[PDB]
């Protein structure tokens, strides 16, 4: 206040120094970022096939929150605990001489593409969850259509990683559960009908579902200037 | 097999809001068949017709109105003021030998991003107990009357486009204004607009095209 | 050049080691004149848009 006196500075066109502006939109971009972003963007440019159009189309957050809320206690034996599996049938089958059946059969979450694929053909699985991931689209396209023609459940979720993280892997893509618990049997039933009206029957309408055909905010707002300011004012 | 008359649809032409009886005539255009129609493709058409039959007057039977195609709503397309041409027997009748004729050029624009050009041709007459069947001008007469007509029209056409332009040309305010002004010395009769035509419109936008409807 | 003193090489004046000072005289008079003509042609705008 005592000696705080200011003066004005113009910035308005053809004069004055233009300071720290948010270049975020128009910045120099390399070949790697160039294709990965315009990749999912060229995927919204043309119409998504009848087979796809389901990729981006998925389950709701809250329902999937429980499909992981109990799946965490279903973490397989890591290097240290898998080595602890070998020390339980070594201090039992020798010190008490057991007949193989000493440690109870596994009751955790299932992992494995080729195998969880064979689980739906023999429908030996109690539940099946599918992921809308994988770089090669045409590589895992048969997961949803087989579950449909065999009657096995499939809920496309956002997280093929958590499938394998709480399973000792990195990726898995198929989180099945042909078993259950002497208390978590309620989770099996509840989810079988919840995921039923989630995608199983939804496919009856999603039978000939097409997507895509969308442009950027640029060809969208000026698209609402020619074709929109044509009749509607 | 040709038979193109069964492919020509009939369109009805309407009139502006500054004129009477909107129903003019029934003409033909082109109905969509072997692929091709008549909508948002060309629209490079106008209208040539006297406002005398489009109003109801005989003693005042002159001044041809020029129009332009706007938008079509279910076989009922309107038109807007985009010109006003004349006939040759109108100019060749007013202009005789032994008298003086004048040419006055002027440019006037509006506030809707519209542009048009107007003209004005002036003539002379006699006085009480006239003997001589002749007499010319003196140059210091034609200069003054020219800059007077341009003044009144360039400040009475700006704003609300051709809506106000026609609100003074049909009721003849310009004809009685210049006639009584220079009447203090040398009057001069007739002096109309003659040929006047527009040529630059804004673009589209249904918002500005609705402010002038009836 | 780089092996002399300031008070020997160039001078202890404004733009003494850049232009010539003669073409620099027609500068201060041209620059300071349109800085006062700029405040004179600045406050006139502060009233041309105040009456309305």
């Amino acid at each position: 206040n005592p000696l705080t006196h200011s003066t004005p500075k113009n910035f308005g066109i053809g004069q004055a120094v233009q300071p720290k502006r948010n270049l975020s939109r128009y910045v120099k971009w390399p070949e790697y970022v160039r294709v990965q972003r315009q990749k999912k963007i060229l995927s919204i440019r043309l119409k998504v096939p009848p087979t796809i159009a389901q990729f981006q189309y998925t389950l709701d957050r809250n329902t999937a929150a429980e499909t992981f809320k109990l799946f965490n206690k279903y973490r397989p034996e890591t290097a240290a605990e898998k080595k602890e599996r070998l020390t339980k049938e070594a201090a039992a089958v020798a010190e008490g001489k057991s007949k193989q059946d000493a440690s109870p059969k596994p009751y955790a979450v299932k992992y494995g593409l080729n195998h969880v694929v064979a689980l739906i053909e023999n429908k030996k699985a109690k539940l099946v969850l599918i992921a809308n991931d994988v770089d090669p689209i045409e590589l895992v396209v048969f997961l949803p259509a087989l579950c449909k023609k065999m009657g096995v459940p499939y809920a496309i979720v956002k997280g093929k990683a958590r499938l394998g993280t709480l399973v000792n892997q990195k990726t898995s893509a198929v989180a099945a559960l042909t078993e259950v618990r002497a208390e978590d049997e309620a989770a099996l039933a509840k989810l079988v009908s919840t995921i039923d009206a989630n995608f199983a029957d939804k496919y009856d309408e999603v039978k000939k579902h097409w997507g895509g055909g969308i442009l950027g905010n640029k060809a969208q707002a000026k698209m609402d200037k020619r074709a929109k300011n044509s009749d509607s004012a | 097999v040709v038979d193109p008359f069964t492919r020509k649809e009939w369109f009805d032409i309407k009139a502006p809001s500054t004129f009477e009886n909107r129903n003019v005539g029934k003409t033909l255009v082109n109905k969509s068949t072997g692929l091709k129609s008549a909508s948002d493709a060309l629209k490079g058409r106008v209208v040539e017709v006297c406002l005398a039959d489009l109003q109801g007057s005989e003693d005042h039977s002159f001044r041809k109105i020029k129009l332009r195609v706007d938008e079509v709503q279910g076989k009922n397309l309107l038109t807007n003021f985009h010109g006003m041409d004349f006939t040759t027997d109108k100019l060749r009748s007013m202009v005789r030998k032994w008298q003086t004729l004048i040419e006055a050029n002027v440019t006037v624009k509006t506030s809707d991003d519209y542009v048009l050009r107007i003209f004005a041709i002036a003539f002379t007459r006699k006085q009480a107990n006239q003997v001589k069947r002749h007499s010319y001008a003196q140059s210091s007469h034609i200069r003054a009357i020219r800059k007077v007509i341009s003044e009144i029209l360039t400040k009475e056409v700006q704003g609300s486009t051709l809506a106000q332009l026609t609100s003074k040309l049909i009721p003849e305010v310009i004809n009685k204004e210049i006639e009584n002004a220079t009447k203090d010395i040398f009057p001069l009769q007739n002096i109309h607009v003659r040929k006047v035509k527009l040529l630059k419109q804004p673009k589209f936008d249904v918002g500005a095209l609705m402010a002038l409807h009836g | 050049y780089a092996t002399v003193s300031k008070t020997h090489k160039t001078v202890s004046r404004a733009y003494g080691g850049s232009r010539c000072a003669n073409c620099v005289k027609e500068r201060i008079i041209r620059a300071f004149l349109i800085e006062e003509q700029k405040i004179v042609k600045k406050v006139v705008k502060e009233q041309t848009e105040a009456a309305k």
Binding site: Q15, V17, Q18 | - | -
Partner: protein, 252 residues
């Protein structure tokens, strides 16, 4: 037969640009933010002539609007422009001689120079010594400015298309004979070796297509198809007319 001059010059070596001493090229200030919006307070450095041309160039330096910086850009010659002329550049900068902005952002009949089919090209057509261009049509629907070139072209460009008012400083350059082919030798000193030229009726059959004959003549009609072979190309390429020139070329 052997190979001919023009066909040999196609490969390149010495048929390059005789620059080095030259000040620069012909590229103004590419259209940007303030260039498509408002304008700028331009300042001309000088009118130094290019080392190898006919009409001089206006090295217009621009006051960088991104920090205290002054980069000298380049324009062509403008009939009567002094040193220190405030040549402003902007779509919102008024129509003045030497100043530049969009053709659709200005009137018809206006004669500009260094015209370009694209705004920010820094230089395209209407750039030769002493010539001009005239805007004969303005259609504000889809930015279209119909302008005319020196021979009579109707190239309708953009309304935001770059064009500076004025003619190229250097009129009457060819309206005066050189007499001495020595100053013709002095001009090519900083251009190229596209001179001196000779008659194919003088060279041998192998040397050039007109070649041979101890009586001197072409052999086959000088008239050649507008698209002849890269060996039979030397003469009258598409002369629908030939004798009393009317400047007609593609269709006039």
């Amino acid at each position: 037969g052997r190979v001919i001059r023009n066909q040999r010059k196609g490969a390149g070596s010495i048929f390059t640009s005789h620059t080095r001493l030259r000040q620069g090229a012909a590229k103004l200030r590419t259209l940007d933010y303030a260039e498509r919006h408002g304008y700028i307070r331009g300042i001309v450095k000088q009118i130094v002539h290019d080392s190898g041309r006919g009409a001089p160039l206006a090295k217009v330096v621009f006051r960088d609007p991104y920090k205290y910086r002054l980069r000298e850009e380049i324009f062509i010659a403008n009939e009567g422009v002094h040193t220190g002329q405030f040549i402003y550049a902007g779509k919102k900068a008024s129509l003045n001689v030497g100043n530049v902005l969009p053709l659709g952002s200005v009137p018809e009949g206006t004669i500009v120079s260094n015209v370009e089919e694209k705004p920010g090209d820094r230089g395209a057509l209407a750039r030769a010594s002493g010539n001009y261009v005239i805007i004969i049509g303005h259609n504000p629907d889809e930015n279209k400015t119909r302008v005319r070139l020196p021979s009579g072209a109707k190239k309708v460009i953009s309304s935001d298309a770059r064009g500076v008012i004025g003619v190229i400083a250097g009129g009457g350059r060819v309206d005066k004979p050189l007499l001495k082919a020595g100053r013709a030798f002095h001009k090519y000193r900083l251009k190229r070796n596209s001179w001196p030229k000779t008659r194919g009726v003088a060279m041998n059959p192998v040397d050039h297509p007109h070649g041979g004959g101890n009586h001197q003549h072409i052999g086959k009609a000088s008239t050649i198809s507008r698209g002849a072979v890269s060996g039979q190309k030397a003469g009258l390429i598409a002369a629908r007319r030939t004798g009393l020139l009317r400047g007609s070329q593609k269709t006039q």
